[PDB]
Amino acid sequence: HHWGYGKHNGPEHWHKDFPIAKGERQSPVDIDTHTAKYDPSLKPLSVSYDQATSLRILNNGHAFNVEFDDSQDKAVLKGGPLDGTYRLIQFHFHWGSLDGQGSEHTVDKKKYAAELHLVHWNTKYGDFGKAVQQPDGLAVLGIFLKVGSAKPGLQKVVDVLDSIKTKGKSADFTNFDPRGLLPESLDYWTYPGSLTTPPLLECVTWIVLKEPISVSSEQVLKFRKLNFNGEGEPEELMVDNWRPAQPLKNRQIKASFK
C-alpha cells in the first residue's frame, strides 16, 4: 500500500512502486575510509546560514521536517564539490529504535544513533520541483549524531515534538538557527547519489561530514516518541526510519582531507 518502514512496506518493497530503487546511483552507502580518494582540488565548503529564516515544523508521517523560507538567498551552501549556489529548503533526521542504529550512511560499517539531513536545491533551476529532475539539482549535508553530551542547539527542536506527535500535524517554528547543529570541522566525503526516500530521485550530491555531533540519550529519546500514524489511528512509534546501505556500483567516494 503506501511505503513506510514496516515489514510489509519497508525498503525491500520500494522497487515495486519506484523502480529507480535498484538504480546505479542510489543512497545511502557505506563509506570505506581506506578506499575514499583524497582530492586536493575539492574546495572548502562555504555555509552561510546567518540569514536563515525557519518557518515551520511538520510531521509528514516518515520523519519531521523543519522548513525554511527559500524565496531568496538567505541560507545557502556553496564551494566544496558544488558549482553554483544551493538554498536550504528543509532539514530532517533519520533515527533508530536503539542507540546502535539509526544513521543511513555508515563509516567502515559503523552505524550512528541518527543522521541529520540539511536539504538544498540548485538556484539555477528556479524551484525545488524543477531541481529534483536534474543530476546536479540537490546538495544534502549529512551529519552523524552519536549519544554522549547534550547538544544545546538541538533543544528547541526537542521541545516542540509533543505538539506534532502524529502525521499531518504542524507548528510555527520561527527563529531557529541551524548553525547550532554543525560540528566544529567541515571536513567531508562526497559522492553522487539519490534521495533516501521515495521517489528516490538520483539528483543529489551528498556531502557527508566526518565529525559527528553529540546528543544526549534524553534528546534522542524524545525523537522515538513521535508517531508514524495519524491522530486517532493505532499507535506506531516513529523509529528506524532509515534505509540500509546500497551498492556503490560505478562510483568513487572523494575526501576533502587526509
Is 105 an annotated catalytic residue? Answer: no
Under rule CB under 5 A, residue 105 binds Co ion: no
Quick one: 49 or 91, whose CB is closer to Co ion? 91
Using the contact rule CB under 5 A, the part of the chain among 19-27, 32-40, 116-124, 216-224 near Co ion is 116-124
Alpha-carbon distance 189 to 29, whole Å? 12
From residue 14 to residue 53, the character string flagging contacts with Co ion as x (rule: CB under 5 A) and all else as - is ----------------------------------------
Under rule CB under 5 A, residue 117 binds Co ion: yes
| Residue 235 cell numbers, joined | 499507535
Reduced to 3 states (helix: H, G, I; strand: E, B; else coil), residue 38 is strand
Burial class of residue 77 in the structure, from the number of CB atoms within 10 Å of its CB (0-12 exposed, 13-18 middle, 19+ buried): buried
Q: Which residues 6+ apart lie within 8 Å of 63 measured at CB?
A: 92, 93, 94, 238, 241
Using the contact rule CB under 5 A, the part of the chain among 49-57, 122-130, 188-196, 238-246 near Co ion is 188-196
Task: Check whether 117 is labelled as a binding-site residue.
Answer: yes
Judged by CB under 5 A, the chain residues 196 through 215 that form the site for Co ion are 196
Task: Check whether 196 is labelled as a binding-site residue.
Answer: yes
Task: Check whether 85 is labelled as a binding-site residue.
Answer: no
CB 83, min distance to Co ion, A: 23
Alpha-carbon distance 30 to 219, whole Å? 26
Closest C-alpha to 218, from 150, 145, 164: 150
CB 117, min distance to Co ion, A: 4
Choose the catalytic residue: 8, 13, 15, 62: 62
Alpha-carbon distance 241 to 253, whole Å? 24
Closest C-alpha to 27, from 101, 94, 99: 94
Under rule CB under 5 A, residue 120 binds Co ion: no
User: What are the catalytic residues?
Assistant: 62
Binding-site positions read: 92, 94, 117, 196-197
Binding-site positions for Zn(2+) read: 92, 94, 117
